[PDB]
Design a protein around this ligand. Sequence first.
Ligand SMILES: Nc1ccc(C(=O)O)cc1
Ligand SMILES: Nc1ccc(C(=O)O)cc1
Ligand SMILES: Nc1ccc(C(=O)O)cc1
Ligand SMILES: Nc1ccc(C(=O)O)cc1
Ligand SMILES: Nc1ccc(C(=O)O)cc1
Ligand SMILES: [Ca+2]
Ligand SMILES: [Ca+2]
Ligand SMILES: [Ca+2]
Ligand SMILES: [Ca+2]
Ligand SMILES: [Ca+2]
Ligand SMILES: [Cl-]
Lengths: 347, 347, 347, 347, 347
Amino acid sequence: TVTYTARVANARFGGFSQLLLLWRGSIYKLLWRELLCFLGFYMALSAAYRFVLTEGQKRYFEKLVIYCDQYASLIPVSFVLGFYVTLVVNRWWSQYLCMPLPDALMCVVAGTVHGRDDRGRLYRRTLMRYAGLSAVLILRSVSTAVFKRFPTIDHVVEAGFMTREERKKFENLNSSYNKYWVPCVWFSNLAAQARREGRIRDNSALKLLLEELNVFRGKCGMLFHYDWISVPLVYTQVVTIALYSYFLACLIGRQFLDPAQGYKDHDLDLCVPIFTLLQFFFYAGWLKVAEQLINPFGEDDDDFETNFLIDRNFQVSMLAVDEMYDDLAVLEKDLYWDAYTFQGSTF
Amino acid sequence: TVTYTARVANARFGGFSQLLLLWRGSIYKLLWRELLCFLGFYMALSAAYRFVLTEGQKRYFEKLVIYCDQYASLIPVSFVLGFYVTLVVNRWWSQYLCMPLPDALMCVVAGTVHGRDDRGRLYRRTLMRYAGLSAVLILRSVSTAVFKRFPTIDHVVEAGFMTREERKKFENLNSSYNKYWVPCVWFSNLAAQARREGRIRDNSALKLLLEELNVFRGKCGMLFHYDWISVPLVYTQVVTIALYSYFLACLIGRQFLDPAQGYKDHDLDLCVPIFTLLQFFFYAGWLKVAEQLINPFGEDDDDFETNFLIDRNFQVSMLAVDEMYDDLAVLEKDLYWDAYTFQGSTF
Amino acid sequence: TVTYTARVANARFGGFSQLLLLWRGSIYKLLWRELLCFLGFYMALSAAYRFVLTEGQKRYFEKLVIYCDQYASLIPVSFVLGFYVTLVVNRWWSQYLCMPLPDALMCVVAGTVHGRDDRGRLYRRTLMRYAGLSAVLILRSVSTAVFKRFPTIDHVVEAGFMTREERKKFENLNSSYNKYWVPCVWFSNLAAQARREGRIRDNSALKLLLEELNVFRGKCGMLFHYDWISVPLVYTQVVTIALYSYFLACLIGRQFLDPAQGYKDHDLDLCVPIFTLLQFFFYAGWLKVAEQLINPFGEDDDDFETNFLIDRNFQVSMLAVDEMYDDLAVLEKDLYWDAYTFQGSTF
Amino acid sequence: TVTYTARVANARFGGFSQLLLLWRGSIYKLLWRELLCFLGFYMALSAAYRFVLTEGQKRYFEKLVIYCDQYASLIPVSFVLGFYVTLVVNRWWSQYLCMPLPDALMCVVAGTVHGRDDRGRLYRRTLMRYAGLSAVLILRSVSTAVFKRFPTIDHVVEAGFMTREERKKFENLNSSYNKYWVPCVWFSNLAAQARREGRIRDNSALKLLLEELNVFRGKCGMLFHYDWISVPLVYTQVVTIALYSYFLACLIGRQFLDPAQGYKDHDLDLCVPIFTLLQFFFYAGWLKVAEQLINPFGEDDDDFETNFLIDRNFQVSMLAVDEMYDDLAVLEKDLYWDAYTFQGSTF
Amino acid sequence: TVTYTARVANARFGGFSQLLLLWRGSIYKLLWRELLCFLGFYMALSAAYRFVLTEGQKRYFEKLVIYCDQYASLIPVSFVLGFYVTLVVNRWWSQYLCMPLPDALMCVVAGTVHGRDDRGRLYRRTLMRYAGLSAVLILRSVSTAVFKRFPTIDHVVEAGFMTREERKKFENLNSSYNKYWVPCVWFSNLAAQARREGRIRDNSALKLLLEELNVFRGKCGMLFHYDWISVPLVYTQVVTIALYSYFLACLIGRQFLDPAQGYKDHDLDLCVPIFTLLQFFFYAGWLKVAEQLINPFGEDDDDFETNFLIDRNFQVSMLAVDEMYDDLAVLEKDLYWDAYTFQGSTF
Ligand SMILES: Nc1ccc(C(=O)O)cc1
Ligand SMILES: Nc1ccc(C(=O)O)cc1
Ligand SMILES: Nc1ccc(C(=O)O)cc1
Ligand SMILES: Nc1ccc(C(=O)O)cc1
Ligand SMILES: Nc1ccc(C(=O)O)cc1
Ligand SMILES: [Ca+2]
Ligand SMILES: [Ca+2]
Ligand SMILES: [Ca+2]
Ligand SMILES: [Ca+2]
Ligand SMILES: [Ca+2]
Ligand SMILES: [Cl-]
């Protein structure tokens, strides 16, 4: 994730201009190779047309250029591209919102699972760790960066997310499908045991715990579903073919013909085709942003910080349910006990 | 479902190009026959115009070609097609999200329905199987693949989803409508009986069970409603007629006329009309993807894996509520008990 | 409702072509009269221009035709039409989703309202019938077909939805507004009485009953709000005027002028204007589908089957809460007690 | 609100044509003055060009007309207008859905707050009246019509919504912000008191009451937020300037020039510019509908019936919680105790 | 926030015209500098072309102008700009809806945390202050204005949001991530303590408190996520580059060439290019509104009133939970105890 929210807090005079200088997570970083290749094939064609083809070959190439120029517009680049990009962006935001977080569960566990002794500490820490382990399992299933960090379940064990006994239970389970849900069932069983033992003092607290756990597990399952149900490959292939075919047609009809032939719209020979290069920049950049966002769990600069989120969630959950449990400051009267650096339209 | 999420994890140099080689779940597989037929009727027309029609017939055909070329654009292909495809894609994703899953119910049942003896096992397994049977009944009602797998209720009985006594109760029910809801009523009655018998220890647990069951049954009912309330047939007919009429008009006005006649925009005779074939490819591919996604429960390559989901859900639910019930690893201190391979914009 | 989901289960070679033959719920059925009238006024104008007007009148009519042809495009038909159709389709789906269904309530009542005797039967049946009666009252308020089926409250009484005593209570209520909510208040009072009498064994069950009843009543109220708050009449008038004015301008400028005058773009006299008739077909069909969907509770072929839904809901609710109450099959071990005809991208 | 849902129940032959005759809540009523002014300035310009300007001035005006005609299209009227209208319509529907209604609260209060004596009547009536008073306070804050009906809190007191003692408590509260939330806090305190006194028999009932009250108060707060957070004034100014500038450019380039000068596209002098007047009608009508819907609580014909809703809500809530409390008809066997005027695609 | 809802309550004759005069939160205020710079570079180019370039240089500049005029349209300004603006506006409204408010929590605390003595006052005030402190911490993390108001945690302490002991606990927590969640864990612990001590009389009340607290904390976390996950920088860079490149191309091809050369479409030399300046106004205004809304927590005129909201929330929460606790007016019969200044379409 490349963050620039603070730089755009106010609409200043040079508001978005100062963001053009950034390289990390930039359009240039994602598209400079493609732009260079496009310019290379254009100049190769230009050099051929200028210093290779004969007069008759030149005339035929000019006729072909003028045709490819007037019909290359039959390729519905904008229509398919816009549909595809909108779909990808909606999926991108939904996928980010589907990443599990323990904050709700950690608050519920701090307020519901009781005991200052070692057993209560164990209960709270184990519940938070079960949630974190479900998150880690799903993320390594769906995230290339997380999988590179946890290439095996042994890595998960060595990171403190899974114990050795828990690893034995996890492996001995006879299932051919992803087992990310297993820690959620462990969480449900442990919450039931805590309620039975009296650590959870009321049935409503257990129901709230189970509801929050179901929300968390549903987020993990949504992550799994988004990973499994990709954007239909037909749309990806169609958009890629549309971009490639349109830019090939532009490579031929964006050629600058000899002005001496008197062709209409061919009087100025700039040599380098700026507007095609700008048009290629914009359209190929749209497609490249779609490629980056299509799987937001890879290792792109603007992809999600899944490992950072894992570490933050684990640390914060442990802090909240272990160190800050029953550790309030004595009730003290606030500043305004005795009391800077709109009502309505009709009023 | 054809999955390619891992191949697109990072926006690489040849990012989407490597996906053009796939055949299964591809645009080529869905559209090669239609493209071949379109090219066949175009060349038939071209051969007729070239070697059959007389000079006067050729002149008249050229006039007709130039007219069909300048007005074929009055057919609002893009407008209707975009509206239709957006509607279909939204329905496709909603329908996928409407497929019932037992994960929430299985977690609740593992944490709420108690007993290590055979009776508790029976309760948990029967509840999970009632949920799975509701899912199977609705899916065979709405999915052609599932129906082919379960052509009769006897097949459902032989798969272990329904017992013989349950089959007798199911058939003896005097109803002329789909009975997918019957297992949900069985689930409610069995949950009430378990609560009465003490297997469910508190009323809040029963309420949570009923809420999760209602979520599951609502997903099944949404599947039924999506199956029943098709996309309005008027839109389907209009889009199909628009595509057919536009491509017939293109079959006549995309003809390459004899350049010797001096018609404007007719100087290069390529023989094969690439841009029309590319335009046909893109628009007909849009429509074909809409056809594939309109019923995502068929047997298209990119359709949902309903049978795989059925098997996975059954296996996972049985595992969670039978083998992993009250089977936790003893509470063990984690790695960080005593403690790799952003704060805000204003900060 | 015209259903064709099964015919489109797989994207076959002639996928959507086989749907063009359907008449019921078709574009032809909705638009053939309008198309015939449009063609009639066009040919009347054509016959006048061909065999009535003099040479000078013909020249003036040709000038008028060429003007109406180049400016008729200033009417933003596509823009307003697309906005209107999107609004109408979104409202159509939301309205369908707002139709109350007793499935959730029937499951809750089967699992919560107890008693195998006649009193428990009466409680369950009366609650389900109160829900059904609220649905019927709202539907006859908003649905022309339902009102034709229940033109008076006496018809509701004779259908078994309302009793005579309930009819007296309903009529004696001093209210000038729609009373569809009255059965919901009756349901709340009856649920409270059942809880007090012990038929509902716990307060959580009563809370769940009330929550489901509130969901049902909210769906009925949403139906009422959709019926009351129509799509703004300004948009309807604007879209209708846009279509009418554009097609009148086309009736004059889509005329085929005498080719002997040498007007540009007027060399081929087809007599029947196909592309205008196709353009009229598509745009007027869009508008006609909007008209059909604007009130989905009328008696159009593709409108909702409100009466079928009423009958199905009543029958299913009665079955679930009367015949299937406490009528489970004895707990039997399933097939797989002792155990056909993906994990992640990073894996 | 102008309702025409019944007139459009079925897609008849003259479906939307019969709605063009309506005046109330019509496009003509909202736009006839603007159309008259536009036509007045056009004819003033036409009369000047025809009978005032000299030959040289006429030639210069013709050159200016032909320029303003070919570039007036650089003003992105459709783009900004469509974005703005979509935003406004979405906000319009959301605002309507944000209007509080007591139906859920009234059902909960009828089923949960008990007592046939005067004290129970007082409790139920006071709770319903607190909800209604919160609605009234927010509406008079945000609705010009409601404020005209309740220009002062004394008017609220005299309407029976607030008592004199409640008015003293309301005024003595030291707050500089809108106090619409005060009746919600009164409702919470009164519900707590009723639960303590035994009128509410269980804690779950109190929780349900508080949840419904929070839903109601959230709707009131959403009304307040929509009133406060207007559509960004930048968008309003931009759209207004775009419409004004485009129609001024049309006022100059939609002029009909003397055909004797031989200007291309200027052969027919109609005098009155129909297509510009139709284009002005459509675009200015779009903008005027946006103006009407931007604040749906004013006194436009199609604005919400806030006062009618206030009266209906108060009357219905009082009826439900006072007259229909514990007033059920004796449980009677229905018509079908002993038992008119689809299953699935795969089946 | 600039509010104009009351001025647009009714669609008056000069409805939106009277809003063009506003300066604060206006398009002029945001765009006058950019418009002045654009006009400056255009006139510099115009003066160069008029009084510097020679005849041959003038001819070459005219050829370059006519090219940049016909191809500057290959830059997809509208497409990318519309996508970007829609994304930004959706995020803007979602971010506003994500701002935490204590109204629900304050109602729950008033109705659930009991005691007229000093201890109950302390409990209620401390809970409301914990919610307010979480809001303040998140806002100063994400809002530049709030951070300027609270540049350090010492400022938070001196504002009464945090006590000195609470500050010590907050700082002693070993965490490298944003601690806005810490007051939420304090709230959960304090609610648990209040329930244990008997201030909260039932477990359902505690569950409701925890649910409302989780809603509040989720809103704060959504604020954090929106601040962190900016709109992808690739889209920002692409839109900025598109606008800059299009307007540079317009700066060259919007030049007015010498009419004596007989270039087509160059007969009238206005000197100042109005339509380009209007087109620049509209497109750059779209982009500038996007810049303003991209971070709605800055100090733009139309940005959110975060400090006002903080003050209002604190004051209202304190009032509701301290002064209005158990301070109802005695139950009094209303005006209509003994009883101004639609039913359905089928009816
Ligand atoms: N004929 C041409 C038209 C346009 C361009 C270009 O701007 O790239 C190049 C050549
Ligand atoms: N006249 C023609 C115009 C275009 C095409 C084509 O690209 O297919 C073919 C013929
Ligand atoms: N001049 C005309 C242009 C088009 C049409 C038509 O296709 O209907 C008819 C006449
Ligand atoms: N030159 C003109 C072009 C169009 C119109 C018009 O239709 O209003 C008027 C004049
Ligand atoms: N050739 C030109 C075309 C248009 C404009 C303009 O309206 O700004 C200026 C010059
Ligand atoms: Ca990626
Ligand atoms: Ca299909
Ligand atoms: Ca209809
Ligand atoms: Ca208004
Ligand atoms: Ca800003
Ligand atoms: Cl609950």
